[PDB]
From Swiss-Prot, chain B:
Its main location: cytoplasm. The 26S proteasome consists of a 20S proteasome core and two 19S regulatory subunits. The 20S proteasome core is composed of 28 subunits that are arranged in four stacked rings, resulting in a barrel-shaped structure. The two end rings are each formed by seven alpha subunits, and the two central rings are each formed by seven beta subunits. The catalytic chamber with the active sites is on the inside of the barrel. This is Proteasome subunit alpha type-3. It comes from Saccharomyces cerevisiae (strain ATCC 204508 / S288c) (Baker's yeast). Belongs to the peptidase T1A family. InterPro entries: Ntn_hydrolases_N, Proteasome_alpha, Proteasome_alpha-type, Proteasome_asu_N, Proteasome_bsu_CS, Proteasome_sua/b. CDD domains: proteasome_alpha_type_4. It is found in: Cytoplasm; Nucleus. SUPFAM superfamilies: N-terminal nucleophile aminohydrolases (Ntn hydrolases). The gene is PRE9.
Curated annotation (Swiss-Prot), chain C:
Belongs to the peptidase T1B family. The proteasome degrades poly-ubiquitinated proteins in the cytoplasm and in the nucleus. It is essential for the regulated turnover of proteins and for the removal of misfolded proteins. The proteasome is a multicatalytic proteinase complex that is characterized by its ability to cleave peptides with Arg, Phe, Tyr, Leu, and Glu adjacent to the leaving group at neutral or slightly basic pH. It has an ATP-dependent proteolytic activity. This unit is responsible of the chymotrypsin-like activity of the proteasome and is one of the principal target of the proteasome inhibitor bortezomib. The gene is PRE2. This is Proteasome subunit beta type-5. Its main location: cytoplasm. GO terms for biological process: proteasomal ubiquitin-independent protein catabolic process; proteasome core complex assembly; proteasome-mediated ubiquitin-dependent protein catabolic process. The side chain of Thr-1 acts as a nucleophile, and the N-terminal amino group acts as a proton acceptor. It comes from Saccharomyces cerevisiae (strain ATCC 204508 / S288c). Keywords: Cytoplasm, Hydrolase, Nucleus, Protease, Proteasome, Threonine protease, Zymogen. The chain holds residues 76 to 287 of 287 of the full protein. One of its GO terms (molecular function) is threonine-type endopeptidase activity. The active site is at residue 1.
UniProtKB/Swiss-Prot annotation, chain E:
The lineage of its organism: Eukaryota, Fungi, Dikarya, Ascomycota, Saccharomycotina. It is found in: Cytoplasm; Nucleus. This is Proteasome subunit beta type-3. GO terms for cellular component: cytosol; nucleus; proteasome complex; proteasome core complex, beta-subunit complex. Pfam families: Proteasome. GO terms for molecular function: endopeptidase activator activity. There is a cross-link at residue 69 (Glycyl lysine isopeptide (Lys-Gly) (interchain with G-Cter in ubiquitin)).
Curated annotation (Swiss-Prot), chain I:
It is found in: Cytoplasm; Nucleus. The gene is PRE5. There is a cross-link at residue 188 (Glycyl lysine isopeptide (Lys-Gly) (interchain with G-Cter in ubiquitin)). Keywords: Cytoplasm, Isopeptide bond, Nucleus, Phosphoprotein, Proteasome, Ubl conjugation. This is Proteasome subunit alpha type-6. The proteasome degrades poly-ubiquitinated proteins in the cytoplasm and in the nucleus. It is essential for the regulated turnover of proteins and for the removal of misfolded proteins. The proteasome is a multicatalytic proteinase complex that is characterized by its ability to cleave peptides with Arg, Phe, Tyr, Leu, and Glu adjacent to the leaving group at neutral or slightly basic pH. It has an ATP-dependent proteolytic activity. It comes from Saccharomyces cerevisiae (strain ATCC 204508 / S288c). The keyword Cytoplasm applies.
């Protein structure tokens, strides 16, 4: 079997294949996660270079791992499917053996472990993918939001963004997100997430996707018109 | 030892691109143009054979359009031999699903499976990727008529109308201009042929340089029919649409 | 052998006998048939002595690894299922095991799982396993209530083993008692059946068939 | 290119030496061993204020009597911790006892040189392993990706290590109390950290015979930081 | 205990003038217990028909297997499989499980689309082909069917006459077998039309 | 395990399964639920060898739940029954076969029809208006053959089921400690708590 | 058909004192009605103040002891010459035995020594690894002849104080090493009279804080 | 698992003051057929060890080849192969005993009973037994098969315990062995008159005696024995 | 240069550079001495610390009751090779009831190290070993190089500045070989030998490591206050 060590150290102590995997994430469409007091919202960018697209059947950017946890990503689309599949299998395996669904932290730790493994295994390259994993632990009302990256490090975030121009939207979130008082309602959280994407997106038409996750497996994706109403209200307040 | 001669087919560039995937896509850009158009009452698949000869036996020839099952077909752009490897795998996958669940495989599930196979060749094994892009035309009872494409990266996307192979930039602009959502199969047939006629590198578009196929619910009542067009039938539709 | 375990208001009572036989030959009267998996979990020994000892000690190692990795006490459900899934892999090879995995957690409350070498895993309120199980069930069924005090429940478990020890030839020696609370199990001593029988006879007025 | 297991002309393994450079870029971790216990402390170093700092887990329990702090590519440490936990528990299963701190450290270090063309590269993380056993008492070990481990009275790893080690050279003596060691770790962390030290961007822990391995609450550490500030202002 | 007589059932096939016929009972049982009266044992892949008697799980499994294989055949060959070729595929497929066989008694029936020649064949559980001119029998009442077919059959029967002969062969054989009956179906097969007839019979 | 019954009426499927668990000499439990929900509109009851029954049922449940998440779509009862049959047909030629018999009751939301499938441990599948496993059919089928109509209401189906259980309680030597009854219709799965 | 097992007879006895422990065994090795050896040592010093005997099928017994001695050696190598405690040795032997759960060592194993508080300790194993700490334990051929005697004379079972008539038990007073050896000798002398496989010689290994001492006594050779 | 086909009967042995003696007859039986009459079942290893084998002859010939290969292997890169690092009886035995127990543990035994007789470097007598089960034991006298039942009782009258060994000369020991071989010839139906005897002495070394015969037999009393009870003639 | 990328490549003058680079790791290692008489064999090793807070890296490893070694170079490689020796010593005892000859132990180490010098993918061992032992032919001292070369000697030294101790032993050859039945005097000679390799630093109580094996002496290691007698 093909055993070649592709991920190796360089004289300055860097693993370039892992660092170049991050450059693939930088190229990917922007993704953002914001947690309120009783919800988490995942926002995603859709590049409008592709029209004549069939939006019914085209792979959506946010994926359910279980009924209570969701995963979005920035980077190589094909790579992300492999992580999503593995995560979904592990979620069902956890329910089968422990008789309890995965915690958000556990699911994150698993996906991050798979990513790490691909940075020191022979014959494989790292995943060119960073993920945002969000949801609520079983029988718990505290919102959860985690991030992973190609190296395999992971951590919890009050709010976070990944992908292209993520430096700009992180700048926005760092000045607009207050920890002492997070977005108290679904409306406030969605509004802040749409606002953060409008710093980068271009047109507020079919370029913004929003998914709201609430406790007790209550997950819904907002439609074009519902998002368009947020886009309208934001700019009308801005004209002042 | 052997390391000396390893090209390392599954590595990132400094910019975060997969060298071999990008170069395979360059190969595919020289292949004959294939077009897919989705209508309300069916799907059209049209494709251009590459600079043929008068001595080529056309009626027994197949390089572009392949049947995966009774409900799903593909148009090929790239290395034909590479495509046939993947096609046979997809045919087996469809039958595995049918044996397991006693239902015809949904179109996306088949497309995802083939795309995942392509993905694997970019991440592990140290082998070159498949130099193939597919257009999938298919029907199932969940989403109805569906058009997809997949490329050597293993990424796939859904489309109302799409082109692969040569002159896709020019072809996609022409499709984007004349396509409408309430369009019918007969109109889509005309659009596909008109687009190929304008984008072709050949002097004129003739029956011997084309492969054509439709997927219609124009099958008596509540069922779907695949029609791979014969050479004479391509000749007739060229006269009907006013190209020859 | 006679082992029992039952759920009640104040947690779980576990009671076992102490005898081990090789045919008619009494090899031991001092066998520990309650396995202390960890400070919060107990398991009972019936069927194969080695099979129960080995795999329930192993179970404790797996439960310890779980709480290191997850930073949280393992559920009785998850602990019992690790053992049942393990023995199910060995099914047909000749393992002999009939055990009650007993614990008390926040999310579950007091919980008992009957786990068995042919793959069975049953949640329940009252379980009795061994050659003297039928004798113990009689005393249990006719005297059991949810609202038993800890004192009365401990006696009921002790008295039920005594009933089995008396009638069943392969049960006896001594009685070991345990009380499982949310904060852990508590050992309630070793009680010689010889001395216990006469004490219970006099104080209770039972066993009038026996001269003392 | 060149072998992954290649020797340099100086007699050093290229990949091992390069992994040591990755560890120099890592956040600081400090350990101090005393007769009353061993203290472990780390710099958290959050990349952004929106990152919830309590999810940064750079101090980890291996068993009740053994703790561990890390520095470098911290993702690489997860499989090392897993192995260590498994080794500790397995030995207890086989021998009905606690495992010696040295024997645990040796088991972790056996993984280090299992790379070639087994894993594709060395680990890019260094570990401070602290613990207690009956035979050798309170101990602190430094486990490297070379497979070598040294026992230390006190040790610092990461980006501020050589400055911190020079400070530990002067401050450590054989009569240090646990409280004195706690303040000393906090003092030296504060010295080498970029950002200002508080309870949210630094973490303390210890291992004692009585109570075992404990990660300190942010409230507990905050009081020790306030105690440190006052005693430095006292002269 | 004997896998070939747990579920019960029968299949019979006959040739005629420019036609073939294949028929089966509809019973599925668990030994003495009758479970289903709608268990059809005849399947078709294009114009080739396959009857299968024996262990019912294997009957279902083999139908799914030959559907799988004939679908792939068609995609690659760009034509429907013929009875002679399909017969060889059944034989091959059965013999590959020589030392762990499917407990079945398959029967092939069809007309070659090019030559127009009527074709029937039978197999044992490991693939030995029996290519008879006249008739093929299979199942728990195979002895009874041999007796009926051997006396009732004559060559070159017209489609509507052949229907009566095969129907009477099946029915009377099934009525002398505890594990067969509970309904019956007869296929009459010509070069470009196939008729399927359900028979009325005693339900004990 | 012992008695599992099934009946498909006009607009629902009803599954009835015994509550007793016996380990040789003693009845260990009298409230055991011998069923698993595979999807919101599909229920599977089971009976066979100890351990293997629950192991198989939960394994199937996990696989169908995995499919549901991957595709964001509920498989039809027919599709689920075919998947289950293949697993049992695979199992019968294994080193150690699953000795498990099942009934699959589902409501097809596409066709708006209830469906009942009977599958034994060999992988023998049949679609039926009413079915059973083991000796249960020997006592109950003569009553079902007489009274069953395809246009029965759910309430009539339950009454016919009560008559079947009464005959079982009269003529069967074993005490199976009554039955848990569950209904599968367009609105999902619910348990009849008084029977 | 080939039978991989055999029976070499023999009887062994382990008794735990207050600050000592003894492990005794007869020296006769047999098959069927023949004597193989009148002196074939059966109790072994395994190092770290632990004595061991694996009675039954002698080939399996020798294999197990040999593997345990090897385990002690490697415990020293792997854990900085740490002394293997009697409880740790016991758990280790469980794993050696259960490792052959489905093709067992056909032996009854007993080990003796001192625990970590200096008190006398004996552990007893079944063929597949189930074990327990015990005060008094006989194994092998004449175990049924010896144990009832020990119940009576060591634990004072069924013995009450004169004058009380069953009301007050005889108190469990501690026995010396000299007193225990007397009971061991009388146990084996009695077993020799009534069991054909017991005889020839008796070898006793005594364990104290000072180390491991041996004593040998002749038994009847018929 | 197998069955023995061509077999060899008793091997007998004992210790004496300065060394050990071992003996075995030259027969290879095929059930009740006395098929092969020139089989050597004592196999010397160097000048200090003799391995006596009974049971299956094909397995004996295999063991014979293992011991031959052992000597070759010991000589490799060993300048002291004929001195301090020569093969000892104890080394040869432990090797065989390992093999026998390993083979029984794979359920494919070498169907033999073996006695290893020799003298160690320090002059100590070595005598130990191993069989198809891997069972081992030592004693002042050792014997296999019929020898265990008939030879041991006779040899134990000369050396009953350890303290009798220094009191037993080589002449007395050989005499006892030779008498035992006669008794076995009288009473074992699978024995022969022809046998081999080997003495390993710490002073005089290895003496290997071939083509020995049982002599001084008593048969004359048979002429007076008539019928089975009442027959006078 | 162009021929040092892997162990599978000879240079134009027939040299194996990866092996030579592995040999260089030994020269960087701390000094250790070995010497023997007819009755005893001694190892003396200068242990190296990382700093003043650190412990002194152990240099001597026991392989059996009658055999053991001292190391200089990559310590994990010594652990691998000493583990292999432990196993081979153990196999000899279990299977043949025989203590493994020191010469045969040297042959086994040579062959294990050789396989890593002729195959692609692997690397040579980066450690040198001094093996002492007492077997049936008396006291022995071996020197192992990771090239595969094993040599039997009266005395030697390996590591940094080992040439000083090696010259001293070459002078003292006739004296220390005659030190029979006097373990203390043989260690004294070894301590005096290793002193010829010291610069700036001297032999302290936690610096020095000594091991001995002999006629009626199992392989035992002395550290701490047990070597203060010889300082
Ligand atoms: Mg009939
Ligand atoms: Mg009937
Ligand atoms: Mg006797």
């Amino acid at each position: 079997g093909y055993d070649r060590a592709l991920s190796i150290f360089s004289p300055d102590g860097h693993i370039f294949q892992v660092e170049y995997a991050l450059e693939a994430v930088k190229r990917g469409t922007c993704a953002v996660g914001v947690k309120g007091k009783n919800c988490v919202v995942l926002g995603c960018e859709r590049r409008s270079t592709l029209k004549l697209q069939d939006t019914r059947i085209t792979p959506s950017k946010v994926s359910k791992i279980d009924s209570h946890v969701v995963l979005s990503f920035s980077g190589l689309n094909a790579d992300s499917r492999i992580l999503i599949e593995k995560a979904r299998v592990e979620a069902q395996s956890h329910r089968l053996t422990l008789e309890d669904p995965v915690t958000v932290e556990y699911l994150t730790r698993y996906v991050a472990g798979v990513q790490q493994r691909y940075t020191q295994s022979g014959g494989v390259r790292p995943f060119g993918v960073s993920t945002l994993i969000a949801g609520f632990d079983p029988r718990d009302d505290e919102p959860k939001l985690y991030q992973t990256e190609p190296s395999g490090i992971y951590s919890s975030w009050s709010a976070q963004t990944i992908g292209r121009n993520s430096k700009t939207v992180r700048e926005f979130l760092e000045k607009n997100y207050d920890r002492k008082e997070p977005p108290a309602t679904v409306e406030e959280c969605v509004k802040l997430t749409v606002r953060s994407l409008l710093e980068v997106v271009q047109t507020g038409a079919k370029n913004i996707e929003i998914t709201v996750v609430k406790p007790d497996s209550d997950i819904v994706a907002l439609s074009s018109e519902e998002i368009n109403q947020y886009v309208t209200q934001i700019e009308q307040e801005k004209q002042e | 030892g052997s390391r000396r001669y390893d090209s390392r087919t599954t590595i990132f560039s400094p910019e975060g691109r997969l060298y071999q995937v990008e170069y395979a896509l360059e190969s595919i850009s020289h292949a004959g143009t294939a077009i897919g158009i989705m209508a309300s009452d069916g799907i059209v698949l049209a494709a251009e054979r590459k600079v043929t000869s008068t001595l080529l036996e056309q009626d027994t020839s197949t390089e572009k359009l392949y049947k995966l099952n009774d409900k799903i077909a593909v148009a090929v752009a790239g290395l034909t031999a590479d495509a046939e490897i993947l096609i046979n795998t997809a045919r087996i996958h469809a039958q595995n699903y049918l044996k397991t669940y006693n239902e015809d495989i949904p179109v996306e599930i088949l497309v995802r499976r083939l795309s995942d196979i392509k993905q694997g060749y970019t991440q592990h094994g140290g082998l070159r990727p498949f130099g193939v892009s597919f257009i999938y035309a298919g029907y199932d009872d969940r989403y109805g008529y569906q058009l997809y494409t997949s490329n050597p990266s293993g990424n796939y996307t859904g489309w109302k109308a799409i082109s692969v192979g040569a002159n896709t930039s020019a072809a996609q602009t022409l499709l984007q201009m004349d396509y409408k959502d309430d369009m019918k199969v007969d109109d889509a047939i005309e659009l596909a042929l008109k687009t190929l006629s304008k984008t072709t590198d050949s002097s004129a578009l003739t029956y011997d340089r084309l492969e054509f196929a439709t997927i219609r619910k124009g099958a008596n009542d509540g069922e779907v029919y695949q029609k791979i067009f014969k050479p004479q039938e391509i000749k007739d539709i060229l006269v009907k649409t006013g190209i020859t | 052998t006679t082992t029992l375990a039952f759920r009640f208001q104040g947690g779980i009572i576990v009671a076992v006998d102490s005898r081990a036989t090789a045919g008619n030959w009494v090899a031991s009267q001092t066998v520990k048939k309650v396995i202390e998996i960890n400070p919060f979990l107990l398991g009972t020994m019936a069927g194969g002595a080695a099979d129960c000892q080995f795999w329930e000690t192993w179970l404790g190692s797996q439960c310890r690894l779980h709480e290191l990795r997850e930073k949280e006490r393992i559920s009785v459900a998850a602990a019992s299922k690790i053992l049942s899934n393990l023995v199910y892999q060995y099914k047909g090879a000749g393992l002999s095991m009939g055990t009650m995995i007993c614990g008390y957690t926040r999310k579950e409350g007091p919980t008992i799982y009957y786990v068995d070498s042919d793959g069975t895993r049953l949640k329940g309120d009252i379980f009795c396993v061994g050659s003297g199980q039928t004798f113990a069930y009689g005393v249990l069924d006719s005297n059991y209530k949810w609202d038993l005090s800890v004192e009365d429940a401990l006696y009921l478990g002790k008295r039920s083993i005594l009933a089995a020890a008396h009638r069943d030839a392969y049960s006896g020696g001594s009685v070991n008692l345990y009380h499982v609370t949310e904060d852990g199990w508590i050992y309630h001593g070793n009680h010689d059946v010889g001395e216990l029988f006469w004490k219970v006879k006099e104080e209770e007025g039972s066993f009038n068939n026996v001269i003392g | 290119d060149r072998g992954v297991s290649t020797f340099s002309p100086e007699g050093r393994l290229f990949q091992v030496e390069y992994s040591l450079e990755a560890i120099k870029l890592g956040s600081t971790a400090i350990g101090i061993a005393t007769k009353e216990g061993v203290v472990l402390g780390v710099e958290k170093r959050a990349t952004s204020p929106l990152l919830e700092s309590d999810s940064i887990e750079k101090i980890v329990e291996i068993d009740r009597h053994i703790g561990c702090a890390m520095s470098g590519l911290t993702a690489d440490a997860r499989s090392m911790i897993e192995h260590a936990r498994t080794a500790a528990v397995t030995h207890n299963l086989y021998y009905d006892e606690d495992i010696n701190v040295e024997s645990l450290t040796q088991s972790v270090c056996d993984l280090a040189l299992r790379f070639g063309e087994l894993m594709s590269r060395p680990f890019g993380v260094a570990l401070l392993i602290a613990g207690h056993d009956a035979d050798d008492g309170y101990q602190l070990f430094h486990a490297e990706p070379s497979g070598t481990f040294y026992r230390y009275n006190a040790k610092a790893i990461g980006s501020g290590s050589e400055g911190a080690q020079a400070e530990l050279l002067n401050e450590w003596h054989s009569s240090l109390t646990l409280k004195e060691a706690e303040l000393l770790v906090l003092k030296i962390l504060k010295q080498v950290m970029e950002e200002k030290l508080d309870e949210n961007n630094a973490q303390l822990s210890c291992i004692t015979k009585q109570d075992g391995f404990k990660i300190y609450d942010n409230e507990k550490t905050a009081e020790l930081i306030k105690e440190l500030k006052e005693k430095e202002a006292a002269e | 205990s004997d896998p070939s007589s747990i579920n019960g059932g029968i299949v019979v096939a006959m040739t005629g003038k420019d036609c073939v016929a294949i028929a089966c009972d509809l019973r599925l049982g668990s030994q003495s217990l009758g479970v289903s009266n709608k268990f059809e044992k005849i399947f078709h892949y294009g114009h080739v028909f396959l009857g299968i008697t024996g262990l019912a799980t294997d009957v279902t499994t083999l139908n799914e297997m030959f559907r799988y294989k004939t679908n792939l055949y068609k995609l690659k060959e760009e034509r429907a499989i013929e009875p002679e070729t399909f017969t060889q595929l059944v034989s091959s497929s059965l013999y590959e499980r020589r030392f762990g066989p499917y407990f079945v008694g398959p029967v092939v029936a069809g007309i070659n689309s090019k030559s127009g020649k009527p074709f029937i064949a039978g197999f044992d559980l490991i693939g030995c082909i029996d290519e008879a001119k006249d008739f093929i029998v299979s199942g728990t009442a195979s002895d009874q069917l041999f007796g009926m077919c051997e006396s009732l059959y004559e060559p070159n029967l017209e489609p509507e006459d052949l229907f009566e002969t095969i129907s009477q062969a099946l029915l009377n054989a099934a009525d002398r077998d505890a594990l067969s009956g509970w309904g019956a179906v007869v296929y009459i097969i010509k070069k470009d039309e196939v008729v399927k007839r359900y028979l009325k019979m005693r339900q004990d | 395990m012992d008695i599992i019954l099934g009946i498909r009426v006009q607009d629902s499927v009803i599954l009835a399964s015994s509550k007793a668990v016996t380990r040789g000499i003693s009845v260990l439990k009298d409230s055991d639920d011998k069923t698993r929900q595979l999807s919101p509109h599909t229920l599977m009851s089971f009976a066979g060898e100890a351990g293997d029954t629950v192991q198989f049922a939960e394994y199937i449940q996990a696989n169908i739940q995995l499919y549901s998440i991957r595709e964001d779509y509920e498989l039809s009862p027919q599709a689920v029954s075919s998947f289950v049959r293949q697993e049992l047909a695979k199992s019968i030629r294994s080193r150690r076969p699953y000795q498990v018999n099942v009934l699959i009751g589902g409501y097809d939301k596409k066709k708006n029809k209830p469906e009942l499938y009977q599958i034994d441990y060999l992988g023998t599948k049949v679609e039926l208006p009413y079915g059973a496993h083991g000796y249960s059919g020997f006592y109950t089928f003569s009553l079902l053959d007489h009274h069953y109509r395809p246009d029965m209401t759910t309430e009539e189906g339950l009454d016919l089921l009560k008559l079947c259980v009464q005959e079982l309680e009269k003529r069967m030597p074993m005490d199976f400690k009554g039955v848990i009854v569950k209904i599968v219709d367009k609105d999902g799965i619910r348990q009849v708590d008084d029977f | 058909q080939f039978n991989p097992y055999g029976d070499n007879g023999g009887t062994i006895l382990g008794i735990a004192g207050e600050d000592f422990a003894v492990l005794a065994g007869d020296t006769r090795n047999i098959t069927d009605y023949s004597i193989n050896s009148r002196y074939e040592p059966k109790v072994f010093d395994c190092g770290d103040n632990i004595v061991m005997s694996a009675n039954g099928f002698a080939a399996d017994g020798d294999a197990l002891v040999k593997r345990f001695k090897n385990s002690v050696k490697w415990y020293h190598f792997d854990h900085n010459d740490k002394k293997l405690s009697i409880n740790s040795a016991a758990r280790n032997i469980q794993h050696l035995l259960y490792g052959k759960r489905f093709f067992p060592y056909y032996v009854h194993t007993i080990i003796a020594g001192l625990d970590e508080d200096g008190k006398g300790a004996v552990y007893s194993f079944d063929p597949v690894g189930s074990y327990e700490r015990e005060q008094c334990r006989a194994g092998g051929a004449a175990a049924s002849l010896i144990m009832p005697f020990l119940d009576n004379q060591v634990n004072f079972k069924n013995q009450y104080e004169p004058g009380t008539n069953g009301k007050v038990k005889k108190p469990l007073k501690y026995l010396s090493v000299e007193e225990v050896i007397k009971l061991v000798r009388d146990s084996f002398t009695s077993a020799t009279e009534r069991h054909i496989q017991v005889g020839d010689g008796l070898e006793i290994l005594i364990v104290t804080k000072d180390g491991v001492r041996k004593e040998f006594y002749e038994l009847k050779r018929d | 698992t197998q069955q023995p086909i061509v077999t060899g009967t008793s091997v007998i042995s004992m210790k004496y003051d300065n060394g050990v003696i071992i003996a075995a007859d030259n027969l290879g039986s095929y059930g009740s057929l006395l098929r092969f009459n020139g089989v050597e079942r004592l196999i010397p290893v160097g000048d200090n060890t003799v391995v006596g084998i009974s049971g299956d002859i094909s397995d004996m010939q295999h063991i014979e080849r293992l011991l031959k290969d052992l000597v070759t292997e010991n000589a490799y890169d060993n300048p002291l192969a004929d001195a301090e690092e020569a093969l000892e009886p104890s080394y040869i035995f432990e090797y065989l005993a390992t093999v026998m127990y390993q083979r029984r543990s794979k359920m494919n035994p070498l169907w033999n009973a073996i006695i290893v007789a020799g003298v160690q470097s320090n002059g100590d007598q070595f005598l130990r037994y191993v069989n198809l089960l891997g069972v081992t034991y030592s004693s002042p006298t050792l014997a296999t098969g019929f020898g265990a039942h008939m030879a041991n009782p006779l040899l134990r009258k000369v050396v009953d315990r350890e303290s009798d060994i220094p009191k037993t000369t080589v002449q007395v020991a050989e005499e006892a062995i030779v008498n035992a071989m006669r008794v076995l010839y009288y009473r074992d139906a699978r024995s022969s008159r022809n046998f081999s005897l080997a003495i390993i002495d710490k002073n005089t070394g290895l003496t290997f005696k071939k083509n020995l015969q049982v002599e001084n037999m008593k048969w004359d009393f048979a002429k007076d024995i008539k019928g089975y009870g009442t027959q006078k003639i | 240069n162009n021929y040092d990328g892997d162990t599978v490549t000879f240079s134009p003058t027939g040299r194996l550079f990866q092996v030579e680079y592995a040999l260089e790791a030994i020269k960087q290692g701390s000094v250790t001495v070995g010497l023997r008489s007819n009755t005893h064999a001694v190892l003396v090793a200068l242990k190296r610390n990382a700093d003043e807070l650190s412990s002194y890296q152990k240099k001597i490893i026991k392989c059996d009751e009658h055999m053991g070694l001292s190391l200089a170079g990559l310590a994990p490689d010594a652990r691998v090779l000493s583990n292999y020796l432990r196993q081979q010593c153990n196999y000899s005892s279990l299977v043949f009831n025989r203590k493994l000859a020191v010469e045969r132990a040297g042959h086994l180490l040579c062959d294990k190290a050789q396989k890593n010098t002729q195959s692609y993918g692997g690397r040579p061992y980066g450690v040198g070993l001094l093996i002492i032992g007492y077997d049936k032919s008396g006291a022995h001292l071996l020197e192992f190089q990771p090239s595969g070369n094993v040599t039997e000697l009266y005395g030697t030294a390996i590591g940094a500045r080992s040439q000083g101790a090696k010259t001293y032993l070459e002078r003292t050859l006739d004296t220390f070989i005659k030190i029979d039945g006097n373990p203390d005097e043989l260690i004294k000679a070894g301590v005096e030998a290793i002193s010829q390799s010291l610069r700036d630093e001297s032999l302290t109580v936690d610096n020095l490591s000594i091991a001995i094996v002999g006629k009626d002496t199992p392989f035992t290691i002395y550290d701490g206050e047990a070597v203060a007698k010889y300082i």
